[PDB]
């Protein structure tokens, strides 16, 4: 018999992004080819199968720095981190291959799906 | 020129609630008349003007335990904590006064608004 507030999830995500932009309560640095990205472990876990596996590990859950595979493109990661905190994906002809490869590595199934669809349309 | 994934914010909140239910990466205990509630500081801040003010304070941001005012009803808090993580509010004739009072104290404006409206309809 609950009532539901339609905009609540979007408002929560908007506030989490405001905290990220002001570097409030960020608890991890993600290192991508020497580029550094500060974030909240819980948000990373909520969006990515890879971060979910990492931060549920009894040793890695306590790390303040995570280094990604050197093949990962920092721009592709940045676009995906922005998507995690906003639901908005900056998908462009020039970045789609790097974004799809990064989403496959991060295990972000819905992003992989739209990249596959956009690539298929261009062939 | 971004594309947007409609269900992303809801999916993020659903995963944050899954972490809460399994007590994963919870970093604070909220004490309400001896009842204890584990949660994520970022989610509490994203939903409540009171928690936002508390955890942006340079001393309180580091506390692992927060004690609420003794007038706060634990059931009212529990219903609001559930709403924070799900967008669903269990509003009932028997709890509406405690829920509204707790939402006013927590500074959850949209919850206060619907409680005021539901009370006005019954008079």
């Amino acid at each position: 018999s609950c009532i539901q507030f339609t905009r609540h999830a979007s408002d929560v995500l908007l506030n989490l992004n405001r905290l990220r932009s002001r570097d409030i309560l960020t608890d991890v640095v993600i290192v991508v080819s020497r580029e550094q990205f500060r974030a909240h472990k819980t948000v990373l876990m909520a969006c990515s199968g890879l971060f979910y596996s990492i931060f549920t590990d009894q040793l890695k859950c306590n790390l303040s720095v995570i280094n990604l595979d050197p093949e990962i493109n920092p721009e592709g990661f940045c676009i995906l981190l922005d998507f995690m905190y906003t639901s908005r994906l900056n998908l462009r002809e020039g970045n789609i291959m790097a974004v799809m490869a990064t989403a496959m590595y991060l295990q972000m199934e819905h992003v992989v799906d739209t990249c596959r669809k956009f690539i298929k349309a261009s062939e | 020129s971004c594309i947007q994934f409609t269900r992303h914010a809801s999916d993020v909140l659903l995963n944050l609630n899954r972490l809460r239910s399994r007590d994963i990466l919870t970093d604070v205990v909220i004490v309400v008349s001896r009842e204890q509630f584990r949660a994520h500081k970022t989610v509490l801040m994203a939903c409540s003007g009171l928690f936002y003010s508390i955890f942006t304070d340079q001393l309180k941001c580091n506390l692992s335990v927060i004690n609420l005012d003794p007038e706060i009803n634990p059931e009212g808090f529990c219903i609001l904590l559930d709403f924070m993580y799900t967008s669903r509010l269990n509003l009932r004739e028997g709890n509406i006064m405690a829920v509204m009072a707790t939402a006013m104290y927590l500074q959850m404006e949209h919850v206060v608004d619907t409680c005021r409206k539901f009370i006005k309809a019954s008079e």
Partner: peptide, 4 residues
């Protein structure tokens, strides 16, 4: 607010 809605009935979910």
């Amino acid at each position: 607010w809605v009935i979910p």
